[model samples]
Each structure stands twice: as structure tokens, then as C-alpha cells.
Target: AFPVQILPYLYLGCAKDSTNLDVLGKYGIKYILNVTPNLPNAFEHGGEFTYKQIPISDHWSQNLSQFFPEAISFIDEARSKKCGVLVHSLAGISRSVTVTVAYLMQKMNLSLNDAYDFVKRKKSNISPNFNFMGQLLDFERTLGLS
Candidate 1:
């Protein structure tokens, strides 16, 4: 299946989902937000698509929320231009979930509890690592729970 559309202009999935031209074409996606340091962006030589990479791993120590503003902007840029952005990680279970939830928290004005649930409802299997969840908890403090 294609990356699930969690928001009107946001999609979430694994690395394979990012590279599938068949799926990308079907969904009218021309922008990609890849959340990994290892996976390659299969198509970078052309103007057919635009991409942004967040070099973070799904580990406990890595501060995932640090990249939220940029990730959020990438989605906003694509959405502002009337296109969807697929935010993908290695397995689309942890790293991608953290980034997407952080985006919702800051940009959508939701608390961590609300933002996390928002994405989880869109993609039933979404799970952010413990450490990542902690960072988002700290982020909630900055944004202040509402």
C-alpha cells in the first residue's frame, strides 16, 4: 500500500514507500522528507521531485525533536505549494513517528498526548521510541500543554 495520508498534505511510511514511483505517482507526491542517515533518496538528479533529509537514527540517545522545525517546514513548503510530502524512516515505526508527531505538536498547536494520538489514529501501528517520546515530552514543555 502507499504511504498513509495522516494529514491532508502529510503522508507516513517506510523507506520503501519513499522510493516507489508507482505509489508516488498515484498520490501526486513530489516532495519527500526522509528521516534517516542511512537510506538513499533514489531520485535526486532531476527536477521532478524535491527532498529534505533529517539525519537521525531511531536510538534512545539521539535528540529527534531537534529536527522538527525543519521537517515541519519541508511539509509546509510542499503543502503550501499544493503537494503532499511523505515523511519516511527506516521502518516507519519509530523515527518517522517521532518526527511526524513533533510536527503536529508545534505546527498544529497540539500537546504531545494529543499529537501522538493524532498520528497513531491515522496509522494504527505508529510507535516512537522511549527516548524520542521523552524528547517530545520536553518539547511539550516548551510549547506548553494545551
Candidate 2:
């Protein structure tokens, strides 16, 4: 399986190859949110999973904060349906992880630090890039969590 379950129904992972579809099926993942730039949709033809892609660059210059609302909403909707959501970027280390943290902060009412720490405990390798971290801080301010 490409994703690690970070929350009860939320998973974080890297870009998937064709072989990973079975793993997604086995895990009951019905939603996929891709955060990598130029990455093709892995589920465009299927109704099996609802797919949303945010073409984001990992560079510090990109404003990752802009996508938080859509990303969080997608995950929230999937969870409301009692289905699993798989969020992924190129390596599952930066963009995807940052969005997952932001989702936790928004959905669970967690502070930025707390959300990051929580996700870190679930997936030790996650390290959001400096720019993403800055955007997350801005998001925290918007949520009055800073």
C-alpha cells in the first residue's frame, strides 16, 4: 500500500503506479487528492473513487495556502461518507503532508504545531518544505490557532 493512515479515515502517500490500485481497493479508499504538479490522474476513468488534483509546485515560491480549503473540504466530504481518503504528492513528504496537517488543524481544531506533531507521530518521514510551513503558519493565524 502506498499510503499510511494518519487518521481514522485519512491516509497520506506518494504518487501511485498502476499496481497500487488494488491496494487502494483493498483499503476501501474512495477518494484521492493529488498535490503534485503535472501528475496525471490515476483514477480519471473510474467511479470507484472521487478524485481531486491540486497541481502545486514544491518550490518555496508557490503559495500552498491557497489550496487548503479545497483540500480540506474534499477530505472532509469523503470522511463524512464514511470512506477513506488518500492524499498524495510526489514523495508523500512535503506537499501532501502539509495539506494533511492543515486538514487536521481545520477539521480537528488542532493548533498547527499539534497537528504537525500528530501527523509526524503517524508518519515519521513527513517534513513539509519551509514555504509550506510558512503557509501553514498563515493558515493557523486565519483559524486563530497561532
Count of backbone clashes for each model? 0, 0
lDDT of 1 by residue, 24-53 (tens): 889988898989988888776675889888
Candidate 2 contains a number of clashing pairs equal to 0
For model 2 the local lDDT of residue 1 reads 48
In order, what is each prediction's RMSD in angstroms?
1.2, 1.4
lDDT per residue for candidate 2 within 3-120, as digits (tens), equals 7988878889988622287878878887889897788776767457688988898888888889899899999999898899889888889999999999999989999999998989
Worst 10 residues of 1 by lDDT: 38-47
Cα error, candidate 1, residue 18 (Å): 0.7
TM-score of decoy 1? 0.95
